[PDB]
Design a protein around this nucleic acid. Structure first.
Ligand SMILES: O=c1ccn([C@@H]2O[C@H](COP(=O)(O)OP(=O)(O)OP(=O)(O)O)[C@@H](O)[C@H]2O)c(=O)[nH]1
Ligand SMILES: [Ca+2]
Ligand SMILES: [Ca+2]
Ligand SMILES: [Ca+2]
Length: 1118
DNA sequence: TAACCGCGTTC
DNA sequence: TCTAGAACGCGGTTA
C-alpha cells in the first residue's frame, strides 16, 4: 500500500514545480499524420529538455510515467508527462509451449499483471542467431512499477523451486508449465532509463510536445540558456574541531546567479555591515557582489529561500554541497522551524544527496572526483581553480574563520565570494557543457549523469545500442561465493595487466652527450623496410597516395643516408633526442582491431570465424587441498555462534543456520590459520597461459559502441593538438591571442580527458561487478596483446637507441642526434604530410606483425553474407623532443623506480611530473618542498658533472635545515614543513588490529578532542613523529599537530602521556621532533633522485653528507 | 629477509 | 544500492 506515499509525493512535486514555473502542459488534439517533416503544422509546444523524473500520476490507483521539464523559446518554462507501461520478459526452455507458460502466468499473476504478449528478440548466446533465429519471450506489462516488483516477488519462488529438485511421492512413476520458466529478463532496468531508451528522449535536445509524442527539432541544436546559480556557505566552528549542524550556525552564504554576485550575512556573528564590492580575479571572471546584511540566521535562511524562489533556477551548483552545505542548511532550517522542501523543493534522496524536481544540483566536486583526470592532491577548490581557471583564489585558515567574523569581517566576506566565483565559473566553463552534452547521448538526467560511475555510463550507452538493435539484455553478472583451482580454494583471480619496465635512471638533457651502441642488423632491417614503411606513412598514416607526393625520393634518400652513416659508426657519443612514443587510445584500438567484445568470447563447443588469442590468468589460492578443506568445515559445524538479531527469543545459532556467506567468512579465517601452520604460506600465486576464441562474425554492437566513443573523444584530442600548434604560431607580443589560444587548449585537454575516463571504462566494464557483459578473457587478451606490442617496439629501440622507461603502451627513450627524425612530404597541391621516422618505423612494423586479417562484417543482411577484410588501427603517436628527463633509481641493488620521472620542455617549463610525492595527496611537506625545489635545478650546469653540482647545492641547503634541528626556520615554515598528512578512507573503528601513523594520530586526536573527530571517514590526520619514547616503533610516536595549538594544560598531559615521560616540562615542538627520522627521510629522497642516479652515470657522490648504501660502495670499490 | 597492508598514484 | 580495470612506490608491520 506504499502507493500512497508515492502518490502523495507526486502531488507535492506537482505543486513545487508549478510554484517554480513548471505547470503540467497538455497539447492540443490532432488527427493528422505524425511526421517530423511537418513539425510546424502539428499543434504543440516547443521546448528545450532540461530534466526528467519518474512520477506516479492518476488519470485526472497510480499510473507510471515520466515528467519532462522544458524551457521554451519565449523565456518561459513548463513540463509534460509521458506514460509508459513498465515491463520485463519471461524466457522459456521450450519454445513450443510458451502458450502454456503464457496461460499460467496470466492466472498466477492475476493481481498485478495488466497485459502480456509474445515478442522475439535477438539473443547473442543462442545457436544460429547469426542466421536470423530469435528468442521467443513473454512480455509482461504492468500499470506501474509497484506492480512490476510484485510479479518479481511472485516469480522468484518458481525460479527458486525449478532449480531445487522435484519432491516426488510415487517412486515407481516414469511436464508442468511452471518448470518451463527459464528466467526473467530485463527486470532491473530503472523505469526512467526504460522510458528514455524506448522513446528516444534525451535531456539537452529540442522537442515539440504534441499529442502524438515528442518530435525532436533537428533544426535547432544550440542549448538554451538556463538560470544557473552557485552557492557557498561558511559556518562558525569550534577551535581545532569540525562544524556541527546543531551547535554552529551559518555566518554567511555567497552565491552568483547568471553572473551577478550576492552575499547574505548573519549579523549576529558578523561584527559589521558589509558593503557591496567586486572580486574579479581575472578579466574573464567578473564578480560584482551585492550584499544582504540580514539580522539573524533565520533571516539569512529566508533571504536565500526567497531569492531562489524568485529567480527560478533550473540548475544549482555547489562544491561538496551534497555532504556539507545542503545538510547544514537543512538542519539549520529544521532547528529554526523552517522546512527546506516546502520553501525551495529540495530534500535528501535515498543516498543522502540533496535533489529537486525542477532544479538540477551540480556538485562540482563530483565532476572533479570523476572527470577532471586530476590527482587527489589537486582536487581541492584552490587547486582546481588554479589548474582550470588560471588564477589563485582567496585563502583563509579554517581556524581563523570564526574569529574573523568579529575582528576582520570584510576579509571573511572576500574569502566567501572567492569560493563563490570559483564555483560558478568552474561550473559554467567546465561542468555545465560536459554534463549537458553527455545527456544528449546518455538516457539519464543531469543529476545522475554527473554522479553515476563511469562503468554505469558505459552500461547506459550499451543498453541503448542493444535495444535499438533488438538484442536481449543479459542479466547482471554474479560471482560464485567460492571458486576452486586444483582442489585449492581460490582467494582471488585476475589477468596479467600492463607491462612496466624501469630501464635507466639519471639525468638526460638535449645538450649533454650520451653513449650509443647501435645494432647494425637493426639498421639493415630498417633499411629493408624503409621503402614500404614510407609508403605506409603516406597512404595509411596520412590517407594519401604516393602519386601526389613529389619529394618521396628525396625524403627516402635523406633517411637512407642518415641510416647508413649509423650502420658504419656503431659506437657514437652524441647529443640525445628525448622522445615519447605511445599508442593512441591503445586498449580501445586493440579491442576494435581484434573485434574484441564479451559476446565474441566463445568456447570450442559453441561455434574462419574463429581468431585464437592468448591471455595470462593469475590466481591466488590457499596451499591446502580439498582433503584439508572439508576438515575445517566439519569443525566449524560443531561450533556455536551468536544470532544477528541481538535481541531474539534465541541467542545462539548453528553454522548450517548461518548465511552461506558468513559460513565462508569463518571458513576463510580457519583455512588461513591451518595453512600458516602446516604450509607456512597462506597464499600461492600461479600464472597460467590461456587461449580464447574470438568469433569474427558476432553482432558487433559492443565493439561499435567503443569505436564510436573513441572517435568521439578523438575530436577533442585533435582540437587540443590543433590549438597547441596555433599557440606556437602566434607572435609572443600578441597577448590576448595567446591568452585565448591557451584557454582553448585547457578547454579541449579537459574535454578529451573527461571522455577518456569513459573510454577507459569501456575496457574495465567487462570486469565490473554487476556487469551485463562480463568477460575476464576479453580484458586479458587486451592486456597481453598490448604487452606484446610494447616490447616489440622496445626491442627495436634497444637496438637503435636507449629506452629509459616503459609503461603499458608508452616508451620513453633517447635516440642519437643523427637518427632520422622529422620530414615533410610535399604534395602537388602544396599540402604537407608530417613524418616522424621513429614513429612510422614502429607503426609499419606494428601493421606487419599485429594486423587482424580475419575481421568479418555483414555485407548483405537479407541473405546473411559476410565479407572478410584486414583491420588494424593500432598506431604509435610521438611527442618531443624534450629538453630534459630525470629518472630516479632505487636504494637496492639491481632495482629501478617505475612510474616516476620529470620531463622538461625546451622553453624550460615542466612537461610531465609523474608519481612523485610532490604530486600525491598528503605526504611529508619537507619531501614535497624539496622535490619542488630540486627538479628545475637539473637544467642548470654546462656539463653532466656540473649539473649534479647544481642540484647538490639545494640538497645541502635542505640538509642544513635538518642538521640545524630547525633553528634556521621561523616557527611557521617549520610547523608547515615537518607536518606529514595522511587521509583515512574509513573511520578508525574500521581499522581494528592495525598499526599506522594515521591510526595513532586519529586515536590521539580523539582522546584530546572527543569522539566526534572520528565519527566520519576521510579524516585528515596531521602528525609529527616524536623522538621519545626511544627505541619505540614509529607508529607509536605520531603526535597530532593540533596539540601544539591546544591550551598548555592539555598539551603537557597528552604530550607527557604520548612521550612516556611524566617529568617533561619542555613543550617546544622542535625539542619533540625526531630530527634523525626526518633527516633519514630527506636522505632517502636525495639518495633516489640525486646520489645513486649519479653513481649509475659515473659521477662521484655530489652530496657526500648522504652516505651511499653499502652495496654501492662495494660496487665502485671493485 | 619476505609477506603483507593502506594510500595514491601511472597506465 | 551502486559499484570500470591492473601494476606499482613507499612507509610500516609482521611471519
Ligand atoms: O584510468 C585509466 C587509464 C588507462 N586505462 C587503460 O590503459 C590504456 C593505456 O593507457 P593510456 O593512458 O595510454 O590511454 P590511451 O592510450 O587510451 O590514451 P592516449 O594515449 O590516446 O592519451 C587505456 O587504453 C585504457 O584501457 C584504464 O583502464 N584506466
Ligand atoms: Ca567554501
Ligand atoms: Ca596511449
Ligand atoms: Ca597519449
Amino acid at each position: 500500500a506504499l502507493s500512497a506515499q508515492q502518490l502523495l509525493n507526486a502531488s507535492k512535486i506537482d505543486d513545487i514545480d508549478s510554484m517554480m514555473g513548471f505547470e503540467r502542459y497538455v497539447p492540443p488534439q490532432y488527427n493528422g499524420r505524425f511526421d517530423a517533416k511537418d513539425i510546424d503544422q502539428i499543434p504543440g509546444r516547443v521546448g528545450w529538455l532540461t530534466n526528467m523524473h519518474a512520477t506516479l500520476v492518476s488519470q485526472e490507483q497510480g499510473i507510471s510515467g515520466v515528467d519532462f521539464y522544458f524551457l521554451d523559446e519565449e523565456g518561459g518554462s513548463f513540463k509534460s508527462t509521458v506514460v509508459y507501461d513498465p515491463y520485463f520478459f519471461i524466457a522459456c526452455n521450450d519454445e513450443s509451449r510458451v502458450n502454456d507458460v503464457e496461460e499460467l502466468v496470466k492466472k498466477y499473476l492475476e493481481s498485478c499483471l495488466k497485459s502480456l504478449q509474445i515478442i522475439r528478440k535477438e539473443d547473442l548466446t543462442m545457436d544460429n542467431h547469426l542466421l536470423g533465429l530469435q528468442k521467443t519471450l513473454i512480455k509482461l506489462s504492468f500499470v506501474n512499477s509497484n506492480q512490476l516488483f510484485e510479479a518479481r516477488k511472485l516469480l522468484r519462488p518458481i525460479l527458486q523451486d525449478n532449480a531445487n529438485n522435484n519432491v516426488q511421492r510415487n517412486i515407481y512413476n516414469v511436464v508442468d508449465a511452471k518448470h518451463l520458466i527459464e528466467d526473467i529478463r530485463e527486470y532491473d532496468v530503472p523505469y526512467h532509463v526504460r522510458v528514455s531508451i524506448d522513446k528516444d528522449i534525451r535531456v539537452g535536445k529540442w522537442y515539440k510536445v504534441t499529442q502524438q509524442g515528442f518530435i525532436e527539432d533537428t533544426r535547432k541544436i544550440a542549448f538554451a540558456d538556463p538560470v544557473v546559480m552557485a552557492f557557498d556557505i561558511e559556518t562558525t566552528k569550534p577551535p581545532l574541531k569540525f562544524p556541527d549542524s546543531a551547535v554552529d550556525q551559518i555566518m554567511m552564504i555567497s552565491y552568483m546567479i547568471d553572473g551577478e554576485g550576492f552575499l547574505i550575512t548573519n549579523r549576529e556573528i558578523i561584527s559589521e555591515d558589509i558593503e557591496d564590492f567586486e572580486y574579479t580575479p581575472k578579466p574573464e571572471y567578473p564578480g560584482f557582489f551585492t550584499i544582504f546584511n540580514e539580522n539573524d540566521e533565520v533571516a539569512l535562511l529566508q533571504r536565500f529561500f526567497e531569492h531562489i524562489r524568485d529567480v527560478r533556477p533550473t540548475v544549482i551548483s555547489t562544491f561538496n554541497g551534497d555532504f556539507f552545505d545542503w545538510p547544514f542548511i537543512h538542519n539549520r532550517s529544521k532547528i529554526h522551524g523552517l522546512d527546506m522542501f516546502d520553501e525551495i523543493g529540495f530534500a535528501p534522496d535515498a543516498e543522502g544527496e540533496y535533489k529537486s524536481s525542477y532544479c538540477s544540483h551540480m556538485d562540482c566536486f563530483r565532476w572533479v572526483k570523476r572527470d577532471s583526470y586530476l590527482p587527489q592532491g589537486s582536487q581541492g577548490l584552490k587547486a582546481v581553480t588554479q589548474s582550470k581557471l588560471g588564477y589563485n583564489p582567496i585563502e583563509l585558515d579554517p581556524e581563523l574563520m570564526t574569529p574573523y567574523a568579529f575582528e576582520k569581517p570584510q576579509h571573511l566576506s572576500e574569502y566567501s565570494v572567492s569560493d563563490a566565483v570559483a564555483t560558478y565559473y568552474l561550473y559554467m566553463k567546465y561542468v555545465h557543457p560536459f554534463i549537458f552534452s553527455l545527456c544528449t547521448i546518455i538516457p539519464l538526467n543531469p543529476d545522475e549523469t554527473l554522479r553515476k560511475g563511469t562503468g554505469t555510463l558505459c552500461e547506459m550507452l550499451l543498453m541503448v545500442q542493444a535495444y535499438q538493435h533488438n538484442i536481449l539484455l543479459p542479466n547482471k553478472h554474479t560471482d560464485p561465493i567460492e571458486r576452486f583451482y586444483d582442489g585449492h580454494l581460490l582467494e582471488s583471480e585476475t589477468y596479467v595487466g600492463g607491462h612496466v619496465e624501469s630501464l635507466e635512471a639519471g639525468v638526460f638533457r638535449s645538450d649533454l652527450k650520451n653513449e650509443f651502441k647501435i645494432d647494425p642488423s637493426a639498421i639493415d632491417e630498417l633499411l629493408q623496410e624503409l621503402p614500404e614503411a614510407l609508403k605506409f606513412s603516406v597512404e595509411v598514416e596520412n590517407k594519401s597516395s604516393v602519386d601526389k607526393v613529389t619529394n618521396f625520393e628525396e625524403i627516402k634518400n635523406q633517411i637512407t643516408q642518415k641510416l647508413l652513416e649509423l650502420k658504419e659508426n656503431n659506437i657514437r657519443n652524441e647529443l640525445p633526442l628525448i622522445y615519447h612514443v605511445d599508442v593512441a587510445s591503445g586498449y580501445p584500438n586493440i579491442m576494435t582491431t581484434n573485434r574484441l567484445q564479451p559476446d565474441s568470447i566463445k568456447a570450442e563447443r559453441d561455434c574462419t570465424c574463429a581468431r585464437k588469442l592468448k591471455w595470462a590468468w593469475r590466481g591466488e589460492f590457499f596451499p591446502s587441498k580439498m582433503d584439508e578443506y572439508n576438515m575445517i568445515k566439519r569443525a566449524l559445524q560443531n561450533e556455536t555462534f551468536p544470532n544477528k538479531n541481538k535481541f531474539s527469543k534465541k541467542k545462539v545459532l548453528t553454522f548450517d543456520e548461518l548465511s552461506y556467506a558468513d559460513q565462508v567468512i569463518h571458513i576463510k579465517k580457519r583455512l588461513t590459520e591451518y595453512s600458516r601452520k602446516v604450509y607456512h604460506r597462506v597464499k600461492v600465486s600461479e600464472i597460467v597461459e590461456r587461449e580464447a576464441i574470438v568469433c569474427q562474425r558476432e553482432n558487433p554492437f559492443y565493439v561499435d559502441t567503443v569505436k564510436s566513443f573513441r572517435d568521439r573523444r578523438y575530436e577533442f584530442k585533435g582540437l587540443a593538438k590543433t590549438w597547441k600548434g596555433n599557440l606556437s604560431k602566434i607572435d609572443p607580443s600578441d597577448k590576448h591571442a595567446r591568452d585565448e589560444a591557451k584557454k582553448m587548449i585547457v578547454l579541449y585537454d579537459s574535454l578529451q580527458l573527461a571522455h577518456k575516463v569513459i573510454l577507459n571504462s569501456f575496457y574495465g566494464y567487462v570486469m565490473r561487478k554487476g556487469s551485463r557483459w562480463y568477460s575476464m578473457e576479453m580484458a586479458g587478451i587486451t592486456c597481453l596483446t598490448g604487452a606484446t606490442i610494447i616490447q616489440m617496439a622496445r626491442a627495436l629501440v634497444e637496438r637503435v637507441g636507449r629506452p629509459l622507461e616503459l609503461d603499458t603502451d608508452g616508451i620513453w627513450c633517447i635516440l642519437p642526434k643523427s637518427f632520422p627524425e622529422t620530414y615533410f612530404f610535399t604534395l602537388e597541391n602544396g599540402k604537407k604530410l608530417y613524418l616522424s621516422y621513429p614513429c612510422s618505423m614502429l607503426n609499419y612494423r606494428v601493421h606487419q606483425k599485429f594486423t587482424n586479417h580475419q575481421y568479418q562484417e555483414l555485407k548483405d543482411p537479407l541473405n546473411y553474407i559476410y565479407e572478410t577484410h584486414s583491420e588494424n588501427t593500432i598506431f604509435f603517436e610521438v611527442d618531443g623532443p624534450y629538453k630534459a628527463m630525470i629518472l630516479p633509481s632505487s636504494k637496492e641493488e639491481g632495482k629501478g623506480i617505475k612510474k616516476r620521472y620529470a620531463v622538461f620542455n625546451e622553453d624550460g617549463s615542466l612537461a610531465e611530473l609523474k608519481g612523485f610525492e610532490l604530486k600525491r595527496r598528503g605526504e611529508l611537506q619537507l619531501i614535497k618542498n624539496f622535490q619542488s625545489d630540486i627538479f628545475k635545478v637539473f637544467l642548470e650546469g654546462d656539463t653532466l658533472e656540473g649539473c649534479y653540482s647544481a642540484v647538490a647545492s639545494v640538497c645541502n641547503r635542505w640538509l642544513d635545515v635538518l642538521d640545524s634541528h630547525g633553528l634556521m626556520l621561523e616557527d611557521e615554515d617549520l610547523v608547515s614543513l615537518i607536518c606529514e598528512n595522511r587521509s583515512m578512507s574509513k573511520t578508525l573503528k574500521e581499522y581494528e588490529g592495525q598499526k599506522s601513523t594515521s591510526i595513532t594520530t586519529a586515536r590521539r586526536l580523539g582522546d584530546f578532542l572527543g569522539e566526534d573527530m572520528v565519527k566520519d571517514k576521510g579524516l585528515q590526520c596531521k602528525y609529527i613523529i616524536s623522538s621519545k619514547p626511544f627505541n619505540a616503533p614509529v607508529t607509536e610516536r605520531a603526535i597530532p599537530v593540533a596539540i601544539f595549538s591546544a591550551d598548555i594544560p592539555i598539551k603537557r598531559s597528552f604530550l607527557r602521556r604520548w612521550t612516556l615521560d611524566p617529568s617533561l616540562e619542555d613543550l617546544d615542538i622542535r625539542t619533540i621532533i625526531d630530527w634523525g627520522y626526518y633527516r633519514e627521510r630527506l636522505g632517502s629522497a636525495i639518495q633516489k633522485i640525486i646520489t645513486i642516479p649519479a653513481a649509475l652515470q659515473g659521477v662521484s657522490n655530489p652530496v657526500p653528507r648522504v652516505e651511499h648504501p653499502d652495496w654501492l660502495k662495494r660496487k665502485i670499490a671493485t
